[PDB]
Amino acid sequence: EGASFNLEDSGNFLCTTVAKGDSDFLKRLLSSGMNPNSEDYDHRTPLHVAASEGLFLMAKMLVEAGASVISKDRWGNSPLDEARLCGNKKLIKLLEDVKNAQSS
Amino acid sequence: EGASFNLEDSGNFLCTTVAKGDSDFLKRLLSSGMNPNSEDYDHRTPLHVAASEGLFLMAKMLVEAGASVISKDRWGNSPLDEARLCGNKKLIKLLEDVKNAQSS
Amino acid sequence: EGASFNLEDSGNFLCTTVAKGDSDFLKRLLSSGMNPNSEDYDHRTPLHVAASEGLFLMAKMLVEAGASVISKDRWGNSPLDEARLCGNKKLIKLLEDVKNAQSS
Known part of the structure; x- marks a missing residue:
C-alpha cells in the first residue's frame, strides 16, 4: 500500500542504526x-559512520542501497576517503569500485 | 521523587537537539x-556539535550544565578546538575561560 | 556443574562463527x-581470521578473552600480520599493544 518513515533525523537514525550494528x-x-x-x-x-568505524558489511549494504560514496562531510572527506584513513583495505577497494561507477 | 531521563545514547539525542536548534x-x-x-x-x-555549528548560547548552557571543555571528538579535539575551526571569538573565549578554570 | 565444550576443531568452528558474524x-x-x-x-x-577479515569487534572480544597475537599461522603470519593485511588502524594498534604487553 505504501508509507514513508519520515523519521525526524532519519539520516542520523540510520547513522545510529549503523552505529549500534543491528544488521x-x-x-x-x-x-x-x-x-x-x-x-x-x-x-x-x-x-x-560505517567507513569511520570500518563496517565493511554495513557500508556495502548502504552501497547497494545507493549511498553516495562521493558525498563529502562538511569537514570530513568523502566516505571512501574516510575509509582510506580508517583502514580496512577491503572497504577501501570496494568503495573505490563504487566511487568509479558513481562518478561515471 | 527522583526522576531520570533513562535515555540510551542520550549524548546522541542531545546532539540531535542541537541539530533542532531549540535552546x-x-x-x-x-x-x-x-x-x-x-x-x-x-x-x-x-x-x-554546537561548536561546529557556530552556536554560542546553546553551547553556553551546555558548558554551564557540565559539559567539560576537555571533552574530545572522534578526532580527539576539544569543543574549543571545533570553535577555533568555527572562529567565533565569543565562543572561543567562552570555552577558553572555562578551560582555564577547569584545567586545575 | 563444571561444563566444557570439549569440541574437536573448536577453533575452526570459532573461525566459522567469525565468518557468520554472530558476535x-x-x-x-x-x-x-x-x-x-x-x-x-x-x-x-x-x-x-578475524584480523584478516578485519572484524574489529570480534577480534576485540577474543583479545578480551586473551589470545596470542604473536602466534604465526601456516603462512608464518601473526594476527598482527593479518591486521596489517586488513589495514584497519583501530585493529592494527589494538592488536599491536595487546601483542606487545603479552609478548613480554
Missing part, C-alpha cells in the same frame, strides 16, 4: 527504501 | 539533570 | 570455556 534492522530499512544519503548535524552519512 | 528544549533537558557528556556515535559531544 | 555466540563460547588461541588446519586462531 537485520538496516537490511529491513533499506528494504523499505530509506535513503542512506541523508546526512546529520555533522553532515555525515550513515556510510560515513 | 529552550535543550535547556529543559539539561535542567532535568542530564548532561553526562555521552558524546555520539561520531564520538562528538553535543558541545562539539 | 554474541562467539562471546558466549569464549566466556564458557572456549580458548581464543584455538587454531585450525592452517594454524589460525580466530584472532588470525
Whole structure:
C-alpha cells in the first residue's frame, strides 16, 4: 500500500542504526527504501559512520542501497576517503569500485 | 521523587537537539539533570556539535550544565578546538575561560 | 556443574562463527570455556581470521578473552600480520599493544 518513515533525523537514525550494528534492522530499512544519503548535524552519512568505524558489511549494504560514496562531510572527506584513513583495505577497494561507477 | 531521563545514547539525542536548534528544549533537558557528556556515535559531544555549528548560547548552557571543555571528538579535539575551526571569538573565549578554570 | 565444550576443531568452528558474524555466540563460547588461541588446519586462531577479515569487534572480544597475537599461522603470519593485511588502524594498534604487553 505504501508509507514513508519520515523519521525526524532519519539520516542520523540510520547513522545510529549503523552505529549500534543491528544488521537485520538496516537490511529491513533499506528494504523499505530509506535513503542512506541523508546526512546529520555533522553532515555525515550513515556510510560515513560505517567507513569511520570500518563496517565493511554495513557500508556495502548502504552501497547497494545507493549511498553516495562521493558525498563529502562538511569537514570530513568523502566516505571512501574516510575509509582510506580508517583502514580496512577491503572497504577501501570496494568503495573505490563504487566511487568509479558513481562518478561515471 | 527522583526522576531520570533513562535515555540510551542520550549524548546522541542531545546532539540531535542541537541539530533542532531549540535552546529552550535543550535547556529543559539539561535542567532535568542530564548532561553526562555521552558524546555520539561520531564520538562528538553535543558541545562539539554546537561548536561546529557556530552556536554560542546553546553551547553556553551546555558548558554551564557540565559539559567539560576537555571533552574530545572522534578526532580527539576539544569543543574549543571545533570553535577555533568555527572562529567565533565569543565562543572561543567562552570555552577558553572555562578551560582555564577547569584545567586545575 | 563444571561444563566444557570439549569440541574437536573448536577453533575452526570459532573461525566459522567469525565468518557468520554472530558476535554474541562467539562471546558466549569464549566466556564458557572456549580458548581464543584455538587454531585450525592452517594454524589460525580466530584472532588470525578475524584480523584478516578485519572484524574489529570480534577480534576485540577474543583479545578480551586473551589470545596470542604473536602466534604465526601456516603462512608464518601473526594476527598482527593479518591486521596489517586488513589495514584497519583501530585493529592494527589494538592488536599491536595487546601483542606487545603479552609478548613480554
